[PDB]
């Protein structure tokens, strides 16, 4: 098996630059559960909360534009549409609510989940919604007629994170039974199963280019090729548990938010971890409240936005000095698995 270990010593992967802390934005009353960014102009955020609201923050200066109320309970997920001026928010109240960005009033309510719905993802080309939650089923909603067109029977437990892809498998799903399924929706059954995770897969992210996915677990962040469904790579992780979210820059940088408050940055190609940071909790907070609930990159990918459990949004910027003087991180030493 050593031949593989030599083949890990030839590459010397992929230098990148570190990250640092540009800006701190308070202003939520409760926790920040979810964050999404305007896919076109990059001019703002939509941030869920634990206070039921949604507060639309300006990306440029960080000022607060507007407040979108209307959920009775905490908002687990928010997703903004590309081709549409629509905003689909979803909560623990068992409802997926549409939002017309133009006039800022609820348009449609989609009905028929048994219990809280923790993920919405907007299929790129079909005018569909994909919702999922403690139902343990994935519902493909027809955006126009509010008809739960397709239901995907599936994982043996709740469904944490769901994504959409234009070609085959059009829905990737991740559940607390510690599997990740690659779905074929037209026939309505699993195309491929990926079991390699040992515990709940709490987050996924789609690489904007290579047509792959990064899947998470407690201590091990893996990657997966879509299409064939192979494993692609691994990412070197000592115990980071727990991984709340992942985000993939367009430069092939793979972010990992910790529940220990550590921000684990990776290269996507290699699996190498070139940086790990630690956030400052807050003025009056508790050391338990330091963690990262969600995160995203803008359309460019030169800034990072992380909602934290301390009731604050933080904006992490990529250092411009860097280069070879001293960037170098942990420097690519891998222990035998």
């Amino acid at each position: 098996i050593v031949n593989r270990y030599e083949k890990l010593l030839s590459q010397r992967p992929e230098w990148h630059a570190p990250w640092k802390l540009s800006r701190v934005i308070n202003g939520h009353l409760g926790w920040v559960r979810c964050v999404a960014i305007d896919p076109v102009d990059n001019e703002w955020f939509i941030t869920g909360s634990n206070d039921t609201t949604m507060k639309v923050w300006d990306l440029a200066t960080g000022k607060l534009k507007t407040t979108l109320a209307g959920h009775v309970m905490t908002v687990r997920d928010v997703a903004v549409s590309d081709r549409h001026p629509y905003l689909f928010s979803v909560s623990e109240d068992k409802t997926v609510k549409c939002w017309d960005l133009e006039k800022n009033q609820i348009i449609r309510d989609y009905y028929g989940h048994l219990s809280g719905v923790r993920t919405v993802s907007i299929h790129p080309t079909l005018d569909l919604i994909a919702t999922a939650g403690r139902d343990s089923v994935i519902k493909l909603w027809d955006m126009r007629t509010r008809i739960p067109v397709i239901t995907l029977v599936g994982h043996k437990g709740p469904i944490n994170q769901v994504q959409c892809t234009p070609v085959d498998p059009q829905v990737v799903s991740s559940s607390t039974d510690a599997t990740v399924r690659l779905w074929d929706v037209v026939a309505g059954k699993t195309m491929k199963v990926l079991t390699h995770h040992k515990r709940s897969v709490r987050a996924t992210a789609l690489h904007p280019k290579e047509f792959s996915v990064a899947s998470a677990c407690t201590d091990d962040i893996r990657s997966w090729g879509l299409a064939e469904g192979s494993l692609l790579t691994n990412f070197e992780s000592e115990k980071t548990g727990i991984i709340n979210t992942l985000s993939i820059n367009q430069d092939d940088v793979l972010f990992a938010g910790g529940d220990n408050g550590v921000l684990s940055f990776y290269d996507y190609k290699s699996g190498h971890k070139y940086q790990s940071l630690a956030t400052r909790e807050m003025v009056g907070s508790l050391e338990g409240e330091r963690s990262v609930l969600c995160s995203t990159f803008d359309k460019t990918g030169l800034r990072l936005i992380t909602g934290e459990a301390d009731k604050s949004i933080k904006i992490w910027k990529q250092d411009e000095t860097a280069t070879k003087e001293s960037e170098p991180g942990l420097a690519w030493n891998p222990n035998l698995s």
């Binding site: 290579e210 990657s223 090729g225 192979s230 494993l231 692609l232 691994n234 190609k269």
Partner: peptide, 26 residues
């Protein structure tokens, strides 16, 4: 008879493919 017993599982599913060559393009 080795073929029959575990016939489903096999090793190469455990091993990651990108570690051979990075930049292998999907």
């Amino acid at each position: 008879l080795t073929d029959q017993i575990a016939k489903n599982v096999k090793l190469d599913d455990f091993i990651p493919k990108r570690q051979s060559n990075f930049e292998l393009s999907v």
